[PDB]
Design a protein around this ligand. Sequence first.
Ligand SMILES: [Mg+2]
Ligand SMILES: [Mg+2]
Lengths: 101, 154, 140, 132, 197, 149, 101
Amino acid sequence: SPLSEYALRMSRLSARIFGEVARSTDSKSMKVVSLFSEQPLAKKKETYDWYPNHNTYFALMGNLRFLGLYRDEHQDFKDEQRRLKKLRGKGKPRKGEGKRA
Amino acid sequence: EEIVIPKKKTWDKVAVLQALASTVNRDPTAAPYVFHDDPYLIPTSALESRSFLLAKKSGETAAKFIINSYPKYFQKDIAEPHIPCLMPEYFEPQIEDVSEAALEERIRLRKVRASVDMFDQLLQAGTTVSLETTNSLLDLLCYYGDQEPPADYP
Amino acid sequence: LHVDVPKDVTRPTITTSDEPDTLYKRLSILVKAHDRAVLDSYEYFAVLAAKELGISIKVHEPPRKIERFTLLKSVHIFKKHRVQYEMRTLYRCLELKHLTGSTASVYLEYIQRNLPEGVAMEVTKTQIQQLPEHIKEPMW
Amino acid sequence: KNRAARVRVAKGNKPVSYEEAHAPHYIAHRKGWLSLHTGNLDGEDHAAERTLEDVFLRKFMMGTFPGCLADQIVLKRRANQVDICALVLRQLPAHKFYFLVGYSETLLSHFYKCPVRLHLQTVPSKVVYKYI
Amino acid sequence: PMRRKALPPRTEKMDTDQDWPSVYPTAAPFKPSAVPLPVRMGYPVKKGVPMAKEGNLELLKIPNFLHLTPVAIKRHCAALKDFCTEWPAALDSDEKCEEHFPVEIDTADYVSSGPSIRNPKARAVTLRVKLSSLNLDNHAKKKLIKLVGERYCKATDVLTITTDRCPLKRQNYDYAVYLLTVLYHESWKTEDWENSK
Amino acid sequence: RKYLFKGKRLSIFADKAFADEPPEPEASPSLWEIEFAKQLASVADQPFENGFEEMIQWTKEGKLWEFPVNNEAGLDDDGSEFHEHIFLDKYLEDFPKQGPIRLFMELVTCGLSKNPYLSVKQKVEHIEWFRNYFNEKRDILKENNIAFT
Amino acid sequence: YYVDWRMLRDLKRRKMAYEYADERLRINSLRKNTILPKDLQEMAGDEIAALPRDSCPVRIRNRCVMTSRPRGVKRRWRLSRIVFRHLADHGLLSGVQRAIW
Ligand SMILES: [Mg+2]
Ligand SMILES: [Mg+2]
């Protein structure tokens, strides 16, 4: 049914009290209220802190391994494969001195 | 007719823990709480008791050294409310300009030799130094007797 | 201790203020856990603690929730073969009544400090207060 | 055939602990959970952050106590407190354990900004549930 | 340099009339060397018994209540009695409370495990008052009910104002009290356009 | 005989009718006073005796949460009030009092009032940004018959 | 070191979206309405376009934090199905069990 003057003027009196939009606003223009009432996706802690600081973990554990307070079985395994590979003559070439000139 | 509302009691944040602590007594069959509660790790003799604690204090100092020497890895703060005592410490002055304020920082950090150098440099330029600030320098020098504060490091 | 006992144990200082105390008509404590047995033990500890402090308590078990999701079992292809996982949530509601604000703080601290690992609490305090003095009398 | 977390049969000479013996479908039936936090309960947040901390805390303890761990560690979170309960072999001298406890506690309390405590129960040797 | 030998468990020295609360003052993990009980846990193997306490990971995985025993809880609550305050005797019924304290303010706290104590749901506040308790003229009550819309429930005659827009709980709480005051005063005010209903 | 508090005294000093006349912090704590206080604490410094004493120390240092849990402990938004967050039309005075810009800014300030994730300072910054934006676009607005500032 | 160069590009996209969140909010609000002149809206359509492409929050992809897998991830744990199953099948996830019913 239609909204009579009493109904419409009461609705505006209510919106004025509850801090709602008081005017007649299109559905398109109600997005401005949504944009400024909701935290944006890029500002949510889930988004910007999605990853752990992989650099802190890799660096910190490497520093601890060199201080003797942490043991990396994986790295010790790789360190011996490089040592053996260098003896076999398959080691990494120096930069700028690769097979192709 | 009017109801009488009781007057609210108030207490410190540690009051409840203190009340619960009062109930319990020392366990006669257990080692001091500092020592680990394992038969293999219980101090048999008085020499081990002190050695075991010094090893604990030594391990605490090894962690604090790493935290204070690689602070960039211990800077992300995920604790709400914020815990100040679990953040890396910085003791070296970060004010580079040679001003009475920079001298005040060194005095606050308690560096004795660096503060003397910047005080003399301030005198060399002749810039004004407050008597209260000049007294803060003497306090540090007089109390430590011209010697850098004792500390342990590599 | 057989012979060596504390003489005058120190007790915390509790000072009565002049501010009026809050009046909680109800105080609902919804604990959640994956384990039913832990809730049973916590229910016994919490109901015993309330009865010892004079608080009125009732307990019921809200219906449990089971959340299930499906995943792909293989690392590559073999779509039709799946593995399913579930998480079970169990509830115990401790509904307290007619508590002053001092009684609700000491009780909640005591039971929250003793909350087992894996248990989540959701206190829902319901305070009762008079009407605003302006509202009491209509003013034009 | 299912290969997930199943210590397969040999010729009766492979010692396995209680944790290893039971396959995934016995979780919540015969064996419990190694980590206990509130982050996977319904209507609770920060499951991802609790899970990442667990992965690291397990890799840290393996390296910090190399060859001294009798079984997987048990992680218990209460409020902001973290509690690590580890079965450790009696290989190292006693004083060395006091050093590693002080070090590992202080380091992990300044890394996650929470009070972290280490609880060590020492076993003479690994406990064998059955030989498979 | 022989290997170190572990001492015998201290349970051996524990009397059967000891003060157990002192043994486990606070929440701790299960310590087979401190708990003087022959407890066993584990699905037993065929022709086998459940595993023993020493080196038992399953007992360690349990959140035990050894620190919370019936003797401890009673000794604890005895100390905690000085903190409590007495509820006013006159308010012996819920109807009596509605008479003198018609406004109900709902606030929720949440306890979880983690480094952060922050929960988004803790800001919300809910005010519930009955219109019968409010002094409203026949005109006022009709105006109050039209403005509030679905917040008013005819069956229960309760107005529910839920405010979560403000960041903090003290702000949301003060806002709900404000919303009631404006609705009450506006309801009594009569506007000329109201004569056209 | 050897009564501890019965007998002659030095009498160099007199009864303190006036007591503690100068304030304890006559000056900001000096290194001498700051260091002596640290030593007084060490006099009674004994190790933890149980989990309660350990938790008591952690609480005093902020390491352990306070109980009962308050999810907003230490979280005060600049000591603001509800009316500061909700009523934001005071900041729209510089904008045109009527017209399309007013209709738009009404929607903007309505959303900001319903925003619990921003402080008042941040909300004001959003409004200030639009004031400077429309000022820059004065010429395009004038073509459309809208007059700004 | 992060898992791979793809996770590195994603991390930077997440940190540039956080920088440009307010800006892209304020500008985009001027476009999501019917109350402002179309001349202003046509111009705001280009100010938002001129911002760097990595400021756009729809170029973020949720990857397994430990293997950097683009698909198969569960958003509550930020892990791929393969990594999740390894932790779940070992009793290391608190409350996760197999679903039998
Ligand atoms: Mg790679
Ligand atoms: Mg996408």
